[PDB]
Design an enzyme around this catalytic site. Sequence first.
Site, mmCIF file in Angstrom:
data_model
loop_
_atom_site.group_PDB
_atom_site.id
_atom_site.type_symbol
_atom_site.label_atom_id
_atom_site.label_comp_id
_atom_site.label_asym_id
_atom_site.label_seq_id
_atom_site.Cartn_x
_atom_site.Cartn_y
_atom_site.Cartn_z
ATOM 1 N N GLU A 52 0.867 -1.208 0.000
ATOM 2 C CA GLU A 52 0.000 0.000 0.000
ATOM 3 C C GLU A 52 0.887 1.236 0.000
ATOM 4 O O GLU A 52 0.566 2.184 -0.751
ATOM 5 C CB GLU A 52 -0.916 -0.035 1.210
ATOM 6 C CG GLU A 52 -2.075 -1.005 1.109
ATOM 7 C CD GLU A 52 -3.150 -0.721 0.065
ATOM 8 O OE1 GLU A 52 -3.059 0.321 -0.601
ATOM 9 O OE2 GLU A 52 -4.001 -1.635 -0.208
ATOM 10 N N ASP A 92 -12.217 8.297 -8.140
ATOM 11 C CA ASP A 92 -13.521 8.810 -7.680
ATOM 12 C C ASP A 92 -13.347 10.189 -7.038
ATOM 13 O O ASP A 92 -14.338 10.746 -6.581
ATOM 14 C CB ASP A 92 -14.193 7.744 -6.801
ATOM 15 C CG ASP A 92 -13.618 7.638 -5.382
ATOM 16 O OD1 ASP A 92 -12.515 8.182 -5.121
ATOM 17 O OD2 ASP A 92 -14.286 7.049 -4.523
ATOM 18 N N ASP A 150 -15.470 -4.341 9.100
ATOM 19 C CA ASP A 150 -16.600 -3.709 8.353
ATOM 20 C C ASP A 150 -17.433 -4.708 7.548
ATOM 21 O O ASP A 150 -18.551 -4.320 7.163
ATOM 22 C CB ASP A 150 -16.102 -2.643 7.370
ATOM 23 C CG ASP A 150 -17.186 -1.741 6.799
ATOM 24 O OD1 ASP A 150 -18.107 -1.370 7.565
ATOM 25 O OD2 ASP A 150 -17.081 -1.397 5.606
ATOM 26 N N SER A 189 -11.635 10.756 -4.176
ATOM 27 C CA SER A 189 -11.117 10.536 -2.813
ATOM 28 C C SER A 189 -9.592 10.389 -2.879
ATOM 29 O O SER A 189 -9.009 10.274 -3.962
ATOM 30 C CB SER A 189 -11.756 9.324 -2.217
ATOM 31 O OG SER A 189 -11.362 8.162 -2.842
ATOM 32 N N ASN A 231 -7.481 8.899 -5.791
ATOM 33 C CA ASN A 231 -8.251 7.843 -6.483
ATOM 34 C C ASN A 231 -9.090 8.460 -7.613
ATOM 35 O O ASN A 231 -9.382 9.657 -7.602
ATOM 36 C CB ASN A 231 -9.164 7.145 -5.478
ATOM 37 C CG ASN A 231 -8.414 6.621 -4.264
ATOM 38 O OD1 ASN A 231 -8.774 6.857 -3.097
ATOM 39 N ND2 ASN A 231 -7.344 5.930 -4.510
ATOM 40 N N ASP A 236 -6.273 8.290 -0.667
ATOM 41 C CA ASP A 236 -5.804 7.283 0.320
ATOM 42 C C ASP A 236 -4.600 7.815 1.093
ATOM 43 O O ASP A 236 -3.705 8.449 0.469
ATOM 44 C CB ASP A 236 -5.409 5.973 -0.362
ATOM 45 C CG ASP A 236 -6.529 5.127 -0.942
ATOM 46 O OD1 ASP A 236 -7.673 5.375 -0.636
ATOM 47 O OD2 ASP A 236 -6.162 4.145 -1.645
ATOM 48 N N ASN A 282 -8.881 5.451 2.944
ATOM 49 C CA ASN A 282 -9.606 6.296 1.967
ATOM 50 C C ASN A 282 -10.575 7.323 2.601
ATOM 51 O O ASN A 282 -11.416 6.922 3.428
ATOM 52 C CB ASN A 282 -10.347 5.324 1.052
ATOM 53 C CG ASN A 282 -10.958 6.026 -0.122
ATOM 54 O OD1 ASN A 282 -12.096 6.495 -0.039
ATOM 55 N ND2 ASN A 282 -10.114 6.258 -1.099
#
Length: 129
Positions: A35, A48, A101, A50, A46, A52, A59
């Site tokens: 990562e 979209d 989650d 957003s 990202n 990270d 995110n």
Amino acid sequence: KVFGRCELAAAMKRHGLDNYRGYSLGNWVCAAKFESNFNTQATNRNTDGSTDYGILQINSRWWCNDGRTPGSRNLCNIPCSALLSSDITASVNCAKKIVSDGNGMNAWVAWRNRCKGTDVQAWIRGCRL
């Protein structure tokens, strides 16, 4: 801060990630390697819109507030900049919520594509833990 491999393994173990939701410590070290390259300051935008953040690439659409991700949540109730610290406490606390989650560690694309199904115990080989 760029962590050493065993230095990060020791920090993640102290913060209770070893076997957290049944994921051995090597899963978490492998995830951080792919990562962030063990770099607490890593950031990546990202598609979209957003971003990270930090050693576990957490995110801004769900987990932290960066002020520029419209319609997003802040489920870890933290500014995303907190996840860039040399102290990994905030990243680990938030990672524990993420992995609880539903999809487990599949929430981390690098884990799924580069760590899942591999010999992840190799990532803690040699470490005094």
